[PDB]
Amino acid sequence: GALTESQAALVKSSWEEFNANIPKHTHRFFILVLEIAPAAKDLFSFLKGTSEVPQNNPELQAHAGKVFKLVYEAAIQLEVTGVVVTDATLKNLGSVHVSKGVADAHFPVVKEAILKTIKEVVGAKWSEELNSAWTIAYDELAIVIKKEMDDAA
Ligand code: HEM
């Protein structure tokens, strides 16, 4: 619907299972990115010039870890305040995605890699409720980001 408290708890929980194994789950996420769009390898500074996705790289891990934490924090905010707030950070995030060559058409790629990562994290605990929770938070955060992108390009 638009982030009920039970949806918000499901996101927080799954997020906590994600961050219990950062090395594994962030390796997995980038595999799921290149399986959807092999061309995306080149947008990524620590992926470029590699064969396979590094398994123990700190920059890959800190990056993929901020990405997930931002969606999870958008979902708590949609559930608390009813919106995703535009702040320094997300306007900065609009400029950086612009610099790197990210386009609007790119956003569904990262969406499907997050949904698929999360389904492998929770395993048997996966639900349609959890899936649709992650979907709303992502899509609400991509709107605000794309907005910030667009003002500059
Ligand atoms: C809601 C969705 C998104 C979130 C929350 C997000 C979050 C981030 C964050 C936090 C960073 C690092 C910024 C910094 O600290 O410099 C970043 C960088 C980046 N994002 Fe995203 N991102 C999203 C969508 C996208 C999509 C669709 C693409 C395209 C494939 C993408 C590609 C990149 C690239 C290429 C970088 C550059 C990092 C580097 O090379 O070191 N992002 N994103």
69 lines ligand 1 (CB under 6 A): no
Q: Is the CB of 96 under 6 A from ligand 1?
A: yes
| Spacing, Cα 80 to ligand 1 middle (Å) | 25
Write phi, then psi, for 95 (nearest 5 degrees): -75, -45
Q: Decide if 34 contacts 40 (C-beta within 8 A).
A: yes
Q: Pull the structure tokens for residue 133.
A: 């929770």
Identity (one letter) of the amino acid at 79?
E
How was this structure determined? It was done by: X-ray
127's tokens: 């639900």
Mark residue 49 as left, alpha or beta (left: phi above 0; alpha: psi -120 to 50; beta: remaining): left
What is the domain partition of the chain in residue ranges?
Answer: 1-153
Atom of ligand 1 nearest to the CA of 107: 27
- The amino acid that residue 53 corresponds to is V
The DSSP string of 69-122 is: HHHHHHHHHHHHHSS----HHHHHHHHHHHHTT--GGGHHHHHHHHHHHHHHHH
Distances (CA, A) of 96 to 61, 73, 102: 18, 20, 9
Q: Is 45 annotated as a binding residue?
A: yes
Is 69 annotated in a binding site? The answer is no
Experimental resolution (Å): 1.8
Report the top-level CATH class of 1-153. Answer: mainly alpha
CA of 94 to the centre of ligand 1 (A): 9
Ligand 1 pocket check for 45: Cβ under 6 Å: yes
